[PDB]
Amino acid sequence: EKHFKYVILGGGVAAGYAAREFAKQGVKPGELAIISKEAVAPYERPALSKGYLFPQNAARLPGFHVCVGSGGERLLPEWYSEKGIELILSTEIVKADLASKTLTSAVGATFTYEILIIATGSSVIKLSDFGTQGADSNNILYLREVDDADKLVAAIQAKKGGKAVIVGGGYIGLELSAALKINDFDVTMVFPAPWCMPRLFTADIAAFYESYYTNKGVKIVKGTVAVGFDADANGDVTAVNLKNGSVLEADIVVVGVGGRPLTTLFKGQVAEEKGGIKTDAFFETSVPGVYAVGDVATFPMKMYNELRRVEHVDHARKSAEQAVKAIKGKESGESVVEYDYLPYFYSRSFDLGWQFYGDNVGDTILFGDSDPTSAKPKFGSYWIKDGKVLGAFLEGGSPDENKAIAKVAKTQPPVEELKKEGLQFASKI
Ligand SMILES: Cc1cc2nc3c(=O)[nH]c(=O)nc-3n(C[C@H](O)[C@H](O)[C@H](O)COP(=O)(O)OP(=O)(O)OC[C@H]3O[C@@H](n4cnc5c(N)ncnc54)[C@H](O)[C@@H]3O)c2cc1C
Ligand SMILES: NC(=O)C1=CN([C@@H]2O[C@H](COP(=O)(O)OP(=O)(O)OC[C@H]3O[C@@H](n4cnc5c(N)ncnc54)[C@H](OP(=O)(O)O)[C@@H]3O)[C@@H](O)[C@H]2O)C=CC1
């Protein structure tokens, strides 16, 4: 049975950014352990749906270990061993006893902490969770961790030039439809919502992306869901049966239908709200000396005075750093600013890339060049509530333009023929 002052449970984005901050804060060899079910040190998870899948010059570990995704030093396993931070890899915690401050692995092994950081991230929802007919067929694939990405890369080779069906119209759906098309697959997306990213995108924004994908040869089947799968004698998928009675042939099915916080180890033992582990502005839970960061946290979102949960990478890095600062700030009992988070979301596929800052509430205005056939499409949108801009989206912005929309979202300037030179409004704020 192993004993550590600090234990990070999970080997993902938040764990790695917590590790870096601990080292910034003077953590001594022997004090810190990270326990992960993955076989590799903490990595920038966003690469898995993007550069990992390029047919040439793909992203691969150890390339995309944290913290290179935010422009920081790369933490190789040797970085951890040189600082006496122990990585306990290929270790799944099946039991967490917060009363005893003891964690037990699948193999029976035991681990104690004084301070615990929960950074267990999110599940990937699978059609097998629903009991859907034939969802156990081979080449029905999900994407959450690097092992998943390796199976997908392998299938992309094995099914070269074939048919892919992408189930879901959120982030994974967007990114993976584009990745499979760039790998020379015939690609069809299927989803129930009225339009892609249903969610953040307005009808105007969604119509741009839909048209652009159509132009790239991606087929789009809306208003339905997969209700079953055909499979051959080998158990390999051959087709997707849709609710409406149609059937799509498929060599590979990629499914992106959401994720949920991985919190079941702590059911009962901590307060929960909005589907995650409730925290204060320092990421401390119900149980003292127990923190929760990343996707699992439901925390106070100061600029909108609501608790929220966020399932994106920027928040994972920043919440991790906050936690380590708060832990140490009690040790040298000084004082720590409360987390003040500006939501920042983003996605890229094909040659496109957008950013969104703030809160997508209120009435919307579109601005700029919305032509899917433009050489470099550049357009955006503002969200306006109570006379103020609360949210801002921009596709194709420069660094100064993205900085300017972020400042709009942060300052909430009052507004109305903002439709205007829309982007110039942000650029002069
Ligand atoms: C493929 C993909 C691409 C994405 N791209 C983007 C993007 O471009 N932009 C963006 O904003 N967001 C993106 N996201 C969201 C972003 O990656 C997450 O918000 C972020 O990874 C959360 O970090 P975390 O530390 O909370 O969770 P995670 O990084 O998922 O880390 C969880 C860790 O806990 C381990 N674990 C869980 N339970 C146990 C246990 N019982 N025992 C041991 N280990 C355990 C997991 O295996 C893992 O190592 C993406 C997500 C995915 C899956
Ligand atoms: N930020 C980024 O650039 C990226 C983020 N990610 C993250 O990874 C995680 C998983 O992503 P993703 O899977 O795209 O999840 P999302 O929650 O972003 O999107 C999933 C979509 O699938 C819909 N859906 C639900 N059930 C079905 C169904 N049966 N058939 C078809 N569609 C369905 C969901 O609807 P509903 O919400 O109504 O249930 C939702 O619109 C998320 O936490 C996400 O934030 C992943 C890749 C890129």
Residue numbers in the entry: 4 to 418, 422 to 435
Could you share sentences copied from the article?
MDHAR reduces the monodehydroascorbate (MDHA) radical to AsA at the expense of an NAD(P)H molecule, with NADH being the preferred donor. We report, for the first time, the crystal structure of MDHAR of O. sativa L. japonica (OsMDHAR) to understand its detailed mechanism. Structural comparison of OsMDHAR to other proteins, using the DALI server, indicated that it has the same fold as that of putidaredoxin reductase (Pdr), biphenyl dioxygenase (BphA4)18 and rubredoxin reductase (RdxR).
For more detailed information, we attempted to determine the structure of the enzyme in complex with NADP. We prepared an E196A mutant protein, which facilitates the binding of NADP by eliminating the carboxylic acid group. ITC experiments clearly showed an increase in the affinity of OsMDHAR toward NADP on removing the carboxylate group of Glu196.
